[PDB]
Amino acid sequence: YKEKKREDIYIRYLYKLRDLHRDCENYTEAAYTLLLHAELLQWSDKPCVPHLLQRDSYYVYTQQELKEKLYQEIISYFDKGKMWEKAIKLSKELAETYESKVFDYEGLGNLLKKRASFYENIIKAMRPQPEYFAVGYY
Amino acid sequence: YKEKKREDIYIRYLYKLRDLHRDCENYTEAAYTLLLHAELLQWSDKPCVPHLLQRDSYYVYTQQELKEKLYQEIISYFDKGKMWEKAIKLSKELAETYESKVFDYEGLGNLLKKRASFYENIIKAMRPQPEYFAVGYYGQGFPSFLRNKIFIYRGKEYERREDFSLRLLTQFPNAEKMTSTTPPGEDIKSSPKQYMQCFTVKPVMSLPPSYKDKPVPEQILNYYRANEVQQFRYSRPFRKGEKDPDNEFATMWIERTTYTTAYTFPGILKWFEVK
Amino acid sequence: MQAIKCVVVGDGAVAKTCLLISYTTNAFPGEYIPTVFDNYSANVMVDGKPVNLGLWDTAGQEDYDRLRPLSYPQTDVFLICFSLVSPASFENVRAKWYPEVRHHCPNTPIILVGTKLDLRDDKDTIEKLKEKKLTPITYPQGLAMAKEIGAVKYLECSALTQRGLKTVFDEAIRAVL
């Protein structure tokens, strides 16, 4: 579909995978897919296309706001995805968008609270190393 | 000394002023001065010069660390200085230095906690607007830097013109006040027996950088309506032409007198000469 | 922060609005800029806390006594004004302004205020009043009228000098406080 660029059905199947990984708790992988969805958007206010206006809730959703919602969810994932580096990464431009366009200073406070919590998580906790195996089909 | 670049005694007198403002609670001004001290330093680890290694505590103090301590103190000041915009500003590069060189992630947490608190303060609280009065020194008996000089004072939040005027009169003997408030006196441009005239002036709006079009909330506006200001205009009524009784607008011609000073209020002085 | 209603009336021959605008502007004496709109306001503290304050600049033309009382309700303090040099101003205030105010607002701290304090002692003004047989009425009789109402205070000032004018407003604000 990406080859065919019919982005709507593309998003549809993206959400299929998102459901799937939610079932499998691949918060990492689920958040990645969700991001690819979010990747399409722009921080422009105007919802330029109702294609991305999905069936979860269908109304105005000024484009940057939809991006914002996605970013919150992806951050939540990564946080429970036990991978805070990407969390901090995304948080940075989230706070940037806040200060630059919405000035949602309470959101700044919450966001930076979360960023500090994640930095603490990184410095403090330890996480297991996942083994990598090669599979040779023949 | 800055002219003479003997930076040590320079720092010494800087700290003198810091003590002074601490006495006067000019947390804004005190923090400014402290920053000028901090301005000299570099984020390099090496304490390259023990000159800045002061008498408050004298040992290794890796240069970036001394910078760090200064920044913490300046942030504390600004925070109780009720001016969080500079606080956020400085916090930004403080956190940058943390992540880039010291990785002091607990310090990151504390710092960003503080930054969020300040953002809340900005969006939530309201702060008073300080009046700005112009002081016109005239006469010969003034000190050298005062003789026939003009100054503008970052007044308190709500001093009326003659309140501050009288407090200044307390600062001085020979407290005779002029009445031709706008124009000077050439006699007194040479006369002894110090003369003065004082009055409020208009704080010209700053340019909110990168803000020229955004529908920014009020807090941003009101903060820039007060501070980082350097232009100051004074309205000048005048009857120009025919003064018909029913129509005062027939002759209103305003000779709007503006002023540029060296430095941006607020600064390391609660007043400055017009530049 | 908090706002205070402050109605002000007085005949149109005394230019009390000049007093108001000069005070609010914190302008130099004789350097106020006359605006085009009325009902001025400011925000200063007299004590302790900053407060907003609104000066209901009201035209003194007697006809407008059908519109001005609509402004009267829930006014914290009223300020009654005159000209120290106009006997007609005295006759109006003692006869019309004061009685109608007391009627419409029988329950409000009140302060009387004089005007043109310099002209009260201006030799030319007083000699004109005598040659016109008008009275350069002095303080004690205004004081007597203030006692007649028992107004919480009375003060007199001059616009070109603003003498006690700042004070005038200081007791004006503390009247609420």
Side-chain angles (χ1 to χ4, degrees):
Chain A
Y1 281 2
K2 178 162 64 175
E3 156 56 35
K4 298 291 99 177
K5 312 151 291 302
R6 193 57 64 87
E7 40 189 358
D8 187 76
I9 45 177
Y10 187 90
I11 295 148
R12 188 176 45 85
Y13 280 151
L14 297 177
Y15 276 82
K16 313 287 181 60
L17 272 175
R18 195 266 303 147
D19 316 316
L20 275 173
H21 288 325
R22 176 183 54 188
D23 313 333
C24 301
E25 286 72 35
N26 304 4
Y27 306 147
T28 293
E29 193 152 323
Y32 289 165
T33 59
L34 205 44
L35 188 153
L36 277 71
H37 174 211
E39 182 276 335
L40 276 297
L41 288 83
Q42 295 89 327
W43 294 113
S44 310
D45 56 331
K46 186 49 201 81
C48 297
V49 284
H51 310 77
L52 291 85
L53 274 301
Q54 77 293 355
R55 294 92 168 282
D56 304 329
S57 191
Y58 182 70
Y59 57 101
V60 288
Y61 278 159
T62 177
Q63 183 178 5
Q64 51 194 5
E65 198 288 321
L66 183 53
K67 212 163 174 78
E68 190 276 333
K69 267 190 53 183
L70 303 193
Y71 271 101
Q72 303 166 294
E73 187 54 36
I74 294 163
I75 293 306
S76 304
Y77 279 171
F78 277 142
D79 165 66
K80 55 189 173 291
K82 284 320 208 83
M83 185 180 288
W84 302 261
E85 300 72 356
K86 293 302 295 297
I88 307 311
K89 179 184 177 184
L90 306 171
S91 162
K92 288 189 183 167
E93 69 275 16
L94 183 51
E96 195 286 333
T97 45
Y98 290 169
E99 60 81 22
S100 54
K101 321 291 190 264
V102 69
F103 311 89
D104 186 85
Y105 283 1
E106 65 286 37
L108 278 299
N110 308 120
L111 177 49
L112 277 299
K113 184 67 61 66
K114 291 314 285 167
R115 199 183 304 197
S117 61
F118 309 160
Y119 271 110
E120 167 270 337
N121 289 336
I122 301 299
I123 201 64
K124 181 271 300 176
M126 271 56 58
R127 316 165 296 230
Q129 180 65 41
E131 299 93 356
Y132 292 164
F133 316 89
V135 179
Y137 295 126
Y138 287 98
Chain B
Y1 281 2
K2 178 162 64 175
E3 156 57 35
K4 298 291 99 177
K5 312 151 291 302
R6 193 57 64 87
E7 40 189 358
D8 187 76
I9 45 177
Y10 187 90
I11 295 148
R12 188 176 45 85
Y13 280 151
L14 298 176
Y15 276 82
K16 313 287 181 60
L17 272 175
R18 195 266 303 147
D19 316 316
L20 275 173
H21 288 325
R22 176 183 54 188
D23 313 333
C24 301
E25 286 72 35
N26 304 4
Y27 306 147
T28 293
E29 193 152 323
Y32 289 165
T33 59
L34 206 44
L35 187 153
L36 277 71
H37 174 211
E39 182 276 335
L40 276 297
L41 288 83
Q42 296 89 327
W43 294 113
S44 310
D45 56 331
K46 186 49 201 81
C48 297
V49 284
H51 310 77
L52 291 85
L53 274 301
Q54 77 293 355
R55 294 92 168 282
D56 304 329
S57 191
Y58 182 70
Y59 57 101
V60 288
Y61 278 159
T62 177
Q63 183 178 5
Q64 51 194 5
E65 197 288 321
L66 183 53
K67 212 163 174 78
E68 190 276 333
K69 267 191 53 184
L70 303 193
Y71 271 101
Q72 303 166 294
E73 187 54 36
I74 294 163
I75 293 306
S76 304
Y77 279 171
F78 276 142
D79 165 66
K80 55 189 173 292
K82 284 320 208 83
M83 185 180 288
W84 302 261
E85 300 72 356
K86 293 302 295 297
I88 307 311
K89 179 184 177 184
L90 306 171
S91 162
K92 288 189 183 167
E93 69 275 16
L94 183 51
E96 195 286 333
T97 45
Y98 290 169
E99 60 81 22
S100 54
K101 321 291 190 264
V102 69
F103 311 89
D104 186 85
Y105 283 1
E106 65 286 37
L108 278 299
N110 308 120
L111 177 49
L112 277 299
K113 184 67 61 66
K114 291 314 285 167
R115 199 183 304 197
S117 61
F118 309 160
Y119 271 110
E120 167 270 337
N121 289 336
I122 301 299
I123 201 64
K124 181 271 300 176
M126 271 56 58
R127 316 165 296 230
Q129 180 65 41
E131 299 93 356
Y132 292 164
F133 315 89
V135 179
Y137 295 126
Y138 287 98
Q140 206 52 253
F142 272 131
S144 78
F145 59 97
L146 286 195
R147 291 180 176 93
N148 301 342
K149 300 318 282 157
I150 315 300
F151 267 66
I152 302 91
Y153 284 60
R154 187 153 193 292
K156 199 56 85 165
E157 65 270 357
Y158 283 112
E159 287 171 349
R160 309 290 298 206
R161 167 166 61 106
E162 298 77 354
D163 310 339
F164 179 76
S165 170
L166 177 57
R167 275 198 311 113
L168 181 139
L169 302 188
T170 301
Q171 187 85 3
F172 269 72
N174 65 89
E176 59 267 11
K177 279 71 61 180
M178 296 299 102
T179 176
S180 200
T181 183
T182 310
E186 178 44 55
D187 49 345
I188 321 305
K189 286 310 293 298
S190 76
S191 175
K193 191 39 155 81
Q194 297 176 356
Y195 281 7
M196 293 182 286
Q197 38 185 355
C198 172
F199 54 93
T200 318
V201 290
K202 296 296 290 183
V204 161
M205 185 64 72
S206 166
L207 62 84
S210 306
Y211 297 172
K212 267 70 72 166
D213 44 353
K214 286 87 173 179
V216 295
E218 61 85 19
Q219 293 82 335
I220 303 300
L221 322 171
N222 67 41
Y223 174 75
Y224 278 173
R225 291 203 295 275
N227 305 320
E228 300 96 355
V229 292
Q230 207 172 350
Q231 311 287 323
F232 299 91
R233 66 176 69 250
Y234 162 61
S235 307
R236 187 58 193 88
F238 169 55
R239 298 291 183 183
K240 176 170 176 181
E242 186 276 333
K243 278 70 62 181
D244 52 355
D246 197 23
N247 311 319
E248 68 275 17
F249 319 115
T251 44
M252 294 298 101
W253 275 76
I254 303 304
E255 297 68 21
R256 175 60 44 70
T257 54
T258 178
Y259 301 115
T260 64
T261 177
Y263 294 151
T264 73
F265 284 13
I268 62 174
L269 277 180
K270 279 182 177 296
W271 60 94
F272 283 107
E273 69 180 1
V274 64
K275 197 47 68 171
Chain C
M1 72 305 298
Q2 64 91 26
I4 295 292
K5 264 202 193 173
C6 179
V7 177
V8 174
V9 302
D11 50 335
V14 191
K16 278 78 74 172
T17 178
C18 300
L19 282 297
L20 271 66
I21 190 156
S22 304
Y23 166 83
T24 58
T25 306
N26 271 302
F28 200 81
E31 291 304 321
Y32 73 115
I33 294 296
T35 63
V36 306
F37 298 136
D38 311 333
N39 206 355
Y40 301 133
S41 168
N43 190 332
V44 177
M45 62 305 297
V46 60
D47 276 300
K49 82 169 285 291
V51 303
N52 271 303
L53 58 89
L55 307 191
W56 307 82
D57 170 26
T58 56
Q61 280 70 14
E62 58 280 15
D63 46 0
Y64 298 112
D65 207 5
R66 77 279 190 189
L67 318 165
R68 66 184 90 248
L70 299 167
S71 306
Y72 293 180
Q74 61 263 6
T75 303
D76 318 293
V77 287
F78 172 68
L79 274 300
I80 192 66
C81 317
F82 62 83
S83 159
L84 286 157
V85 72
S86 166
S89 73
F90 302 119
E91 304 309 321
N92 186 5
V93 65
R94 282 92 163 98
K96 151 72 173 64
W97 277 132
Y98 172 76
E100 66 87 15
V101 165
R102 287 311 303 160
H103 186 193
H104 301 85
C105 292
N107 52 5
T108 287
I110 177 58
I111 302 95
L112 181 69
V113 293
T115 312
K116 290 182 261 283
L117 194 45
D118 58 329
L119 303 201
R120 160 179 167 178
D121 287 30
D122 185 294
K123 59 95 179 178
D124 175 71
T125 316
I126 65 179
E127 67 183 1
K128 263 55 182 173
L129 263 71
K130 299 289 94 176
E131 84 202 6
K132 87 184 81 159
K133 298 94 199 174
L134 278 195
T135 309
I137 284 171
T138 68
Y139 171 67
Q141 46 278 54
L143 174 144
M145 186 65 203
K147 298 289 187 295
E148 185 280 335
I149 182 57
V152 65
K153 197 52 199 74
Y154 160 70
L155 291 166
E156 58 277 22
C157 66
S158 177
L160 210 44
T161 64
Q162 313 150 344
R163 294 178 66 250
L165 187 153
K166 313 201 297 165
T167 302
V168 161
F169 291 77
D170 302 344
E171 292 83 3
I173 304 304
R174 89 186 70 261
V176 170
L177 312 182

